[PDB]
Amino acid sequence: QSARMTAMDNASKNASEMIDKLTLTFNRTRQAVITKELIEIISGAAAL
């Protein structure tokens, strides 16, 4: 019971950390897709 407690403390703390990282990775990606998709439109439009 003391080892399951310890193991589950860690697991839970790793999870949260993973959560915090994926979230930040998500926003970076979200911002780059918009920027990326918009530069693509501008390039096409300017070439005309």
Binding site: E40, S43, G44, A47, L48
Partner: protein, 492 residues
């Protein structure tokens, strides 16, 4: 009345930069015709505008200046074609680069010709043996077929192509002219020392004799790199249209797209998705549709293409990757994960396909590998689903036991293309369960021992399987006998 420079058959460079000449005059040029520059430099008429002709230059534009005279040629771009090219290394226009003398060409061919239609072809039915079990058993390639080799840098894509070219000596050194396969290897964007390395190995394998190498390398002008594939294709159609058989490797179609993109942007054509021209699909479809199988009414010849595409971060869903996967008759996907893991070729069973199926396989092979592909797919799944031995039954323990053994057999080294009957012998051993009790680690060693035995002692069974092309009931019985007994002595 000097009338040599009228503006109907000649023009004068209005401006030149980055390989694009804006020629004035050239009133009678045709779209896509070749023109000549004072400097002996050839170019191609791509944009025919109201007031100018946009000319793409096949070479260093440093020798071109405003004012230069440009002359029509009256000819739409073409190139030398025919048997004279075999064993020679040419540039994207046909000129030799092996400094081994002029090509003795008597025929020419337009680099850009539409692919034969519906009526002139017949279903792909004759195998095109690579020499690679994994490929010849799971993603079979038939003649007239287009099969893509795709994967990240260094996952082994070229190797598949070399082994294939090398495996063709078997038939080329033979008698039968229908089984022969002339090869064409187009390098694009590659590096000269790599190609030089490449043609060396081919020479050392005594394969140059039946190979032509069209080279359009890293320093060649964008338009040469761009053309290179069409050039090489045309040299392959010569064989295709004359009841002969050709095999062309486009290595790779990624660097060509870049070349196209560059040439195209410099012509001021608005960039599209990912910066490429809105017609990059078209750029490759047009080319690969040309690989084809003609009916007996047209010689029964064929052209088989093996285009290469480089993915990034093993992402096959990528726009270009899928653009090309949607043109060819299948793909061979190589993963770096598998490669590092020891699985070489790094063929990814699940993601590779052959749209020709077993129709491109000998009955011997169909017999042994008929259901193996979906078996290995289903194996990879459960192998994952039990990366925790979840109270697993037998049907799945058996599934994992075959899966692993079969995976080891599909492994293979380089430069040693196997003969069809050799593949059938070894797959046979696995697929039949005779190896389900051998230790995975043993399998590779066993295959070298076993194959040794049958090749040396039993060439009667090999020559029959090879000849009948099938596995008769007695051959199948002579084989069961050999494997089981040799296996036992082997596990002493």
């Amino acid at each position: 009345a000097d009338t040599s420079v009228d503006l109907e058959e000649t023009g004068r460079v209005l401006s030149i930069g980055d390989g694009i000449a804006r020629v004035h005059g050239l009133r009678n040029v045709q779209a896509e015709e070749m023109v000549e520059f004072s400097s002996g430099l050839k170019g191609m008429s791509l944009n025919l505008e109201p007031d100018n002709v946009g000319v793409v230059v096949f070479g260093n534009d440093k020798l071109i200046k405003e004012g230069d005279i440009v002359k029509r040629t009256g000819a739409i771009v073409d190139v030398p074609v025919g048997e004279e090219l075999l064993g020679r290394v040419v540039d994207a226009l046909g000129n030799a680069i092996d400094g081994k003398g002029p090509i003795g060409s008597k025929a020419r061919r337009r680099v850009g010709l539409k692919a034969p239609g519906i009526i002139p072809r017949i279903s792909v039915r004759e195998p095109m043996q690579t020499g690679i079990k994994a490929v010849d058993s799971l993603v079979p390639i038939g003649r007239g077929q287009r099969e893509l080799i795709i994967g990240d840098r260094q996952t082994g894509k070229t190797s598949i192509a070399i082994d294939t070219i090398i495996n063709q000596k078997r038939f080329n050194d033979g008698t039968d002219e229908k089984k022969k396969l002339y090869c064409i290897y187009v390098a694009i964007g590659q590096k000269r020392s790599t190609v030089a390395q490449l043609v060396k190995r081919l020479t050392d394998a005594d394969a140059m004799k039946y190979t032509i190498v069209v080279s359009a390398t890293a320093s060649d002008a964008a338009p040469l790199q761009y053309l290179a594939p069409y050039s090489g294709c045309s040299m392959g159609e010569y064989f295709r249209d004359n009841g002969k058989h050709a095999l062309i490797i486009y290595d790779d179609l990624s660097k060509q797209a870049v070349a196209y993109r560059q040439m195209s942007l410099l012509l001021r054509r608005p960039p599209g998705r990912e910066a490429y021209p809105g017609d990059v699909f078209y750029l490759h479809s047009r080319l690969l549709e040309r690989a084809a199988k003609m009916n007996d009414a047209f010689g029964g010849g064929s052209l088989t293409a093996l285009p290469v595409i480089e993915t990034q971060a093993g992402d096959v869903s990528a726009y270009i990757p899928t653009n090309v996967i949607s043109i060819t008759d299948g793909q061979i996907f190589l993963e770096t994960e598998l490669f590092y893991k020891g699985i070489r070729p790094a063929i990814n069973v699940g993601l590779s396909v052959s749209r020709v199926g077993s129709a491109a396989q000998t009955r011997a092979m169909k017999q042994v590998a008929g259901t193996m592909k979906l078996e290995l797919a289903q194996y990879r799944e459960v192998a994952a689903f039990a990366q925790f031995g979840s109270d697993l039954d037998a049907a799945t323990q058996q599934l994992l036991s075959r899966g692993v053994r079969l995976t080891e057999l599909l492994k293979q080294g380089q430069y040693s293309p196997m003969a069809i009957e050799e593949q059938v012998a070894v797959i046979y051993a696995g697929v039949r369960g005779y190896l389900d009790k051998l230790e995975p680690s043993k399998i590779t060693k066993f295959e070298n021992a076993f194959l040794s035995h049958v090749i040396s002692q039993h060439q009667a069974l090999l020559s029959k399987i090879r000849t009948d092309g099938k596995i008769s009931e007695e051959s199948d019985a002579k084989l069961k006998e050999i494997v089981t007994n040799f296996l036992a002595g082997f596990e002493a």
